[PDB]
Structure 1
């Protein structure tokens, strides 16, 4: 159970974005239905009034929280991967449009899941803004909690993989457009009951065997990390 508070750009806090530049749902409940329209941008998918200005090559940092800003972020039980996708705003996140900019699942060296590192990072994870056409975009940040993912929602609606999905409205101003945005995948649609990483038993299967759901990260992606960029308590 987690939500996005706002974003940072190049380590500068853009301020509380809830219902402003984030398409915030009304609470931190997970999405579980893989075929639902709620998979696109969660349960209150509507245009919100602002779009955060960035440039190609900037660091865009999502900041998550549980109940209040810079709290425990998400329950430690919620082991799983983190991804970020992009789509053009005109698309309104419909069609084969979502392009993957980032994936982190399990880090064998530190023996940590993406979610564990997100807690340590005070809820912060980043992407580098790619050299796509200037204009308006949606960035879709997605946490998959696997603690009940030994079952499929479609078979048992009490259980399933849990999706914490947040869409940010981002405007890219300066960019030379040298890596024009390629075909992506639909949400809902890309994840099905047979997709690797959707049904998984984190209790019995080694984390080193986990494969995150496709698609792969776009070659045009410029980078990203789970790491604290800014200190929320210095406000």
Structure 2
């Protein structure tokens, strides 16, 4: 159970984005149905009134929370990977338009899942804004919680992988457009019951055998990490 509060650009807090530049759902409940339109941008996907201005090479940081800002973020039971996708705003998330910019699943070095790291980072994870065409974008951050992913939703709707999905409206202003954005994948559509990483048992399989759902990270992606960039107590 987790939601995006807002974003930071280059370490500078853009302010509370809920229902403003984030297409926020009414609450922190997971999406589970792989075929639902809810997989795109969660349960209240509509245009919200603002969009965060960035330039290529900027660091764009999502900030998540559980109940209140900078709290425990997400229950530590919710082990799983984190991903960020991008699509042109013109699409409204439809079609084969989602390009992956970041993936983190299990870090063998630290023996930590992405979600575990996210807690330590106070909810913050970032991507470097790529050299795509100027214009309007949706960045879709996705946390997959695996604590009931030993079942499939399609077979048992009380269990299943849980998706915490948040779409931010981002305006890319300055960019040389030297990595024109490719075709991506559809949400719903890319994840199916057979997809690696959707059904997995985190209690018996070793985490080092986890494989995150494809697609793989686009080669034009400029990086990102799960790491606190700013202090919510102070700005």
Q: Same fold (TM over 0.5)?
A: yes
What is the distance in 2 between the residues matched to 1:159 and 1:149?
7
What is the distance in 1 between the residues matched to 2:94 and 2:175?
24
Deviations along 1:39-61, whole A, 9 cap, x unmatched? 00000000000000000000000
Deviations along 1:105-144, whole A, 9 cap, x unmatched? 0000000000000000000000000000000000000000
TM-score, length of structure 2 as denominator length: 1.00
Secondary structure of the residue that 2:83 maps to in structure 1?
Answer: strand
What is the distance in 1 between the residues matched to 2:41 and 2:208?
29
What is the distance in 2 between the residues matched to 1:131 and 1:12?
21
Secondary structure of the residue that 1:90 maps to in structure 2?
Answer: helix
Displacement of 1:87: 0.1
Displacement of 1:146: 0.1
Alignment size in residue pairs: 235
Secondary structure of the residue that 2:90 maps to in structure 1?
Answer: coil
TM-score, length of structure 1 as denominator length: 1.00
Which structure 1 residue ranges, 4+ long, deviate > 3 Å from structure 2?
none
What is the distance in 2 between the residues matched to 1:176 and 1:64?
31
- In structure 1, the partner of 2:98 is 98
Secondary structure of the residue that 1:14 maps to in structure 2?
Answer: strand
Deviations along 1:196-228, whole A, 9 cap, x unmatched? 000000000000000000000000000000000
Displacement of 1:187: 0.1
Displacement of 1:69: 0.1
What is the distance in 2 between the residues matched to 1:79 and 1:5?
21
What is the distance in 2 between the residues matched to 1:44 and 1:117?
28
What is the distance in 1 between the residues matched to 2:232 and 2:25?
22
2:53 is equivalent to residue 53 of structure 1: yes
Secondary structure of the residue that 2:49 maps to in structure 1?
Answer: coil
Deviations along 1:150-209, whole A, 9 cap, x unmatched? 000000000000000000000000000000000100000000000000000000000000
Displacement of 1:82: 0.1
Secondary structure of the residue that 1:15 maps to in structure 2?
Answer: strand
CA RMSD of aligned residues (A): 0.3
What is the distance in 1 between the residues matched to 2:166 and 2:66?
13
What is the distance in 1 between the residues matched to 2:91 and 2:19?
20
What is the distance in 2 between the residues matched to 1:67 and 1:33?
24
- In structure 2, the partner of 1:175 is 175
- In structure 2, the partner of 1:198 is 198
What is the distance in 2 between the residues matched to 1:97 and 1:158?
30
What is the distance in 1 between the residues matched to 2:80 and 2:210?
9
Q: Which runs of no fewer than 5 residues in structure 1 stay unpaired? A: none
What is the distance in 2 between the residues matched to 1:92 and 1:43?
14
Deviations along 1:1-32, whole A, 9 cap, x unmatched? 00000000000000000000000000000000
